[PDB]
Design a protein around this ligand. Structure first.
Ligand SMILES: CCCCCCCCCCCCCCCCCC(=O)O[C@H](COC(=O)CCCCCCCCCCCCCCC)COP(=O)(O)OCC[N+](C)(C)C
Ligand SMILES: CCCCCCCCCCCCCCCCCC(=O)O[C@H](COC(=O)CCCCCCCCCCCCCCC)COP(=O)(O)OCC[N+](C)(C)C
Ligand SMILES: CCCCCCCCCCCCCCCCCC(=O)O[C@H](COC(=O)CCCCCCCCCCCCCCC)COP(=O)(O)OCC[N+](C)(C)C
Ligand SMILES: CCCCCCCCCCCCCCCCCC(=O)O[C@H](COC(=O)CCCCCCCCCCCCCCC)COP(=O)(O)OCC[N+](C)(C)C
Ligand SMILES: CCCCCCCCCCCCCCCCCC(=O)O[C@H](COC(=O)CCCCCCCCCCCCCCC)COP(=O)(O)OCC[N+](C)(C)C
Ligand SMILES: CC(C)CCC[C@@H](C)[C@H]1CC[C@H]2[C@@H]3CC=C4C[C@@H](O)CC[C@]4(C)[C@H]3CC[C@]12C
Ligand SMILES: CC(C)CCC[C@@H](C)[C@H]1CC[C@H]2[C@@H]3CC=C4C[C@@H](O)CC[C@]4(C)[C@H]3CC[C@]12C
Ligand SMILES: CC(C)CCC[C@@H](C)[C@H]1CC[C@H]2[C@@H]3CC=C4C[C@@H](O)CC[C@]4(C)[C@H]3CC[C@]12C
Ligand SMILES: CC(C)CCC[C@@H](C)[C@H]1CC[C@H]2[C@@H]3CC=C4C[C@@H](O)CC[C@]4(C)[C@H]3CC[C@]12C
Ligand SMILES: CC(C)CCC[C@@H](C)[C@H]1CC[C@H]2[C@@H]3CC=C4C[C@@H](O)CC[C@]4(C)[C@H]3CC[C@]12C
Ligand SMILES: [Ca+2]
Ligand SMILES: [Mg+2]
Lengths: 197, 66, 53, 48, 278, 24
């Protein structure tokens, strides 16, 4: 005779199924009728599986995006160089140690790394240590848009590093050859300093 | 490949009159290259004929417009 | 002194995107289709992809 | 609730502008400090 | 008799006026463009600020250590002040805690100025988490000191400063191993999210629903709210303590998704990072 | 049956509809 009715607003029910579907459970609000409890029994299975298999996926889809997708901004009175090729923690650390040494003059030359692989935590920390001297950008040398992002047209030089410990030297030499081909295709007058195995 | 194309000609149901068309990519590409050898720029002329293209205009006078 | 850019050459490319490397006196663009590219329009580049039509 | 009092127009103006005024003052002070430090460094560098 | 819109709106109009001025400068550049080897002093000052905030000198290292210590101190001050009523009266001439808080907030304002100067892009810097925390933290106390009345407000956002801690440890060359960096990142993010959500729940539950004449208030201490979000975020659930207000339940609905995912994906990783060793 | 080069098929359709008397 409809004597089991519970004064629940729509927002309260939305909150209740938020609490239930996440397996949290509070007991402050719950279904008291038989039909409500049957629907809760079915929705436990259904909505619990849906929540568990959906919320992490939605979060990972929304969260992911380019992190170093910006473009380098040239500053008047200061020159910059572009470094590409075999970009690892060891090679970058050695290059920065031998490039920014205090034994040289007070040279204000910015370094812009262009690499298709996102840096790991150690490389990010190394970049943070050289906060005002080193910038990083994600992209491929074979892509003209990435070469335009780092303002290669105004770069003083382009440096290409090779993996000297590759299993097949011919493959690495060829990859460096097409890196050179791409950078010369974008800007032919740019200076190239590259390693050949 | 042309040598693999020649295998199809041995199928009893493979009939050229009906319309069994084995477009040989290597054969046609080499023929287009040879026709370009006879007259440069003919490969692109032939390729653009088979491709359905719309009617596009460019405001600025460049080579792409013509 | 006759430089080699005037020699008639046709190059077979499997990857259309590499057509930007064939010539150095044009504005390359990855989004530009192969037929719109200058080296293809000049009869210096050919790919089997245009045969798919 | 002894601090309760009518809100004067000066109180309204200060409430709506103290944040921006403080941030602008911080920017101006940091700009002045940076200019002074850069000038001092340039002077110490050139005189040698 | 209630004066919370003042402290809210000082910071609120600060953030809005900042965004408005930035977009106004951008639109002015845009209209101006459409209708029409020595580095500069700006460039030198920007390099100076960037060097200082990156702890590349002794003064920079001292500033970074002070930022760490004063963030911890401001969080502790918020913990102490959470026990006070939501709205009360302050003197500024007899309480040492308020003077310490003002010193901390002045330091944070100067640090924000340095960070703004060192920022490459001002628009994206204005939307940073640390910038928003400063916006909603410093003008409140600045207004409170003259109004002679203190409101709890959004001080829980101070906990968000802990998110910067990991980066600080990378500026001092203390964090170099990938495992240590990952562990510090996870711990900082987890603890900061937990404490900030607990503070938000504490504020909304103790203040009550604004549209119900604040008659929905629940006497919840900060520790009780911390325990409540510990119970919720782990999907345990007890019902001994729960949010009763509408704002509290909306925040619980959002935090269920967020914090539940964070807990599930963080706690095993933190445990496995701490546990492993030779 | 003739082969034409034209932008659209409606353009080549005019070849079959050409009348000598109508275009004398
Ligand atoms: C009277 C009371 C009962 C009335 C009849 C109820 C029928 C519908 C029951 C509700 C559950 C529907 C299915 C559901 O939500 O689960 C679905 C099923 O969940 C999934 O497919 C999970 C995917 C995992 C990968 C999700 O939505
Ligand atoms: C509160 C309102 C704060 C608004 C702050 C806006 C600062 C300038 C933003 C535009 C910009 O990028 O200017 C930059 C200029 O950056 C600066 O150095 C700005 C600070 C000096 C001018 C401050 C206003 C007078 C280009
Ligand atoms: C009221 C409070 C409102 C708070 C809003 C926060 C929004 C944060 C946001 O959108 O920024 C987020 C986070 O911002 C950061 O903290 C950085 C996305 O980052 P981003 O867009 O700055 O990433 C890099 C820049 N691009 C994409 C151009 C390469
Ligand atoms: C009211 C307060 C409610 C709680 C607010 C919590 C906000 C934090 C949050 O949601 O964290 C989340 C943390 O979850 C993530 O997605 C972090 C990366 C996960 C990698 C696995 C959003 O990221 P974040 O703001 O911590 O990003 C960190 C990078 N910086 C340092 C630039 C900010
Ligand atoms: C009024 C009430 C609502 C007020 C506005 C509330 C906005 C913030 C809602 C709280 C959740 C923030 C995001 C969060 O904690 O989840 C974040 C998102 O979680 C993740 O990134 C999980 C990573 C999984 C791998 C964690 O922190
Ligand atoms: C990132 C994704 C998952 C966000 C989802 C947004 C959620 C939290 C929003 C979207 C639609 C919203 C509902 C829309 C309408 C109603 C009816 C109203 O009388 C009370 C609020 C209530 C019940 C809202 C609660 C919150 C709600 C469920
Ligand atoms: C009452 C409260 C909750 C309102 C909050 C509104 C916030 C989330 C909105 C209002 C105006 C918005 C901004 C408007 C314009 C732009 C420019 C765009 O290029 C980047 C995003 C940015 C910078 C938006 C960020 C989000 C923003 C700040
Ligand atoms: C860096 C990010 C997370 C900051 C986002 C700003 C959040 C935390 C702010 C912006 C608007 C704020 C709300 C605005 C209005 C009120 C009404 C008041 O009676 C209680 C606090 C309450 C409910 C505020 C709580 C905090 C709040 C939600
Ligand atoms: C709630 C308690 C744990 C808070 C105690 C203070 C904070 C800062 C704690 C929690 C996480 C800890 C950090 C965890 C890992 C490392 C990496 C190590 O190479 C240096 C110490 C350092 C950086 C720790 C410093 C102290 C730290 C102990
Ligand atoms: C290994 C990691 C996850 C340990 C995290 C430590 C947790 C349990 C600690 C760190 C900070 C702590 C809080 C710090 C301050 C307050 C405010 C005080 O009025 C009551 C206790 C309370 C609410 C503490 C509860 C416990 C707490 C949340
Ligand atoms: Ca080219
Ligand atoms: Mg820089």
């Amino acid at each position: 005779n409809f004597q089991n009715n519970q004064a629940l607003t729509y927002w309260e029910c939305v909150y209740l199924l938020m609490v239930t579907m996440s397996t949290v459970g509070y007991g402050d609000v719950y279904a008291k009728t038989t039909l409500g409890r049957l629907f809760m029994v079915f929705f436990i299975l259904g909505g619990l599986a849906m929540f568990a298999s959906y919320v992490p996926e939605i979060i990972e889809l929304i969260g992911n995006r380019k992190k170093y997708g910006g473009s380098y901004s040239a500053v008047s009175g200061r020159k910059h160089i572009v470094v590409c090729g075999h970009i690892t923690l060891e090679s970058v650390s050695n290059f920065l140690k031998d490039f920014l040494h205090k034994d040289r003059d007070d040279v204000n030359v910015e370094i812009v790394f262009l690499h298709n692989i996102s840096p790991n935590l150690e490389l990010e920390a190394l970049f943070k240590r050289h906060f005002t001297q080193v910038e990083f950008y994600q992209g491929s040398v074979l892509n003209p848009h990435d070469l335009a992002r780092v303002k290669i047209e105004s770069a003083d030089a382009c440096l290409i590093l090779a993996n000297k410990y590759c299993a097949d030297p011919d493959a690495e030499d060829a990859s460096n050859i097409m890196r050179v081909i791409s950078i010369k295709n974008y800007h032919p007058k740019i200076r190239i300093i590259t390693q050949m195995l | 490949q042309y040598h693999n194309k020649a295998h199809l000609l041995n199928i009893p149901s493979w009939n050229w009159k009906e319309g069994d068309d084995a477009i040989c990519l290597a054969e046609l590409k080499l023929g287009f290259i040879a026709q370009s050898c006879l007259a440069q720029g003919l490969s692109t002329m032939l390729a653009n004929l088979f491709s359905m293209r719309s009617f596009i205009k460019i405001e600025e006078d460049t080579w792409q417009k013509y | 002194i006759t430089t080699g850019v005037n020699i008639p050459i046709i190059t077979e490319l499997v990857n259309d995107t590499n057509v930007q490397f064939l010539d150095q006196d044009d504005d390359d663009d990855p989004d530009t289709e192969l037929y719109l590219t200058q080296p293809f329009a000049c009869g210096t580049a050919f790919a089997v992809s245009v045969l798919d039509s | 609730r002894h601090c309760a009092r009518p809100l004067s127009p000066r109180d309204l103006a200060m409430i709506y502008l103290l944040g921006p005024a403080s941030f602008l003052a911080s920017l101006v002070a940091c700009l002045a400090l940076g200019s002074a430090l850069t000038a001092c460094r340039a002077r110490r560098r050139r005189r040698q | 008799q209630r004066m919370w819109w003042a402290f809210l709106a000082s910071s609120m109009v600060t953030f809005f006026g900042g965004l408005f001025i930035i977009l106004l400068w951008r639109t002015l550049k845009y209209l101006w463009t459409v209708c029409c080897a020595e580095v500069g002093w700006m460039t030198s000052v920007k390099d100076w600020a960037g060097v200082m905030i990156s702890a590349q000198t002794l003064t920079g290292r001292v500033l970074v250590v002070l930022v760490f210590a004063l963030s911890i101190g401001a969080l502790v001050i918020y913990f102490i002040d959470s026990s006070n009523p939501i709205e009360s009266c302050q003197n500024f001439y007899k309480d040492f805690t308020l003077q310490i808080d003002m010193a901390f907030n002045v330091f944070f304002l100067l640090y924000f100025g340095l960070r703004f100067i060192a920022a490459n892009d001002k628009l994206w810097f204005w939307l940073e988490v640390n910038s928003v925390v400063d916006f909603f933290t410093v003008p409140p106390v600045f207004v409170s000191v003259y109004l002679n009345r203190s409101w709890l407000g959004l001080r829980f956002l101070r906990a968000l400063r802990l998110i910067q801690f990991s980066e600080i440890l990378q500026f001092l060359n203390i964090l170099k191993t990938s495992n240590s960096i990952k562990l510090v990142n996870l711990l900082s993010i987890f603890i900061s999210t937990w404490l900030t959500a607990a503070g938000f729940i504490h504020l909304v539950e103790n203040s009550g629903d604004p549209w119900e004449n604040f008659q929905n208030n629940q006497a919840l201490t900060y520790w009780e709210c911390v325990y409540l979000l510990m119970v919720t975020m782990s999907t345990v659930g007890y019902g001994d303590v729960y949010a009763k207000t509408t704002l509290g339940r909306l925040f619980m609905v959002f935090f269920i998704l967020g914090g539940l995912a964070m807990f599930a994906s963080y706690v095993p990783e933190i445990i496995e990072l701490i546990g492993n060793r030779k | 049956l003739g082969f034409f080069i034209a932008s659209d098929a409606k353009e080549v359709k005019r070849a079959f509809f050409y009348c000598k008397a109508c275009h004398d």
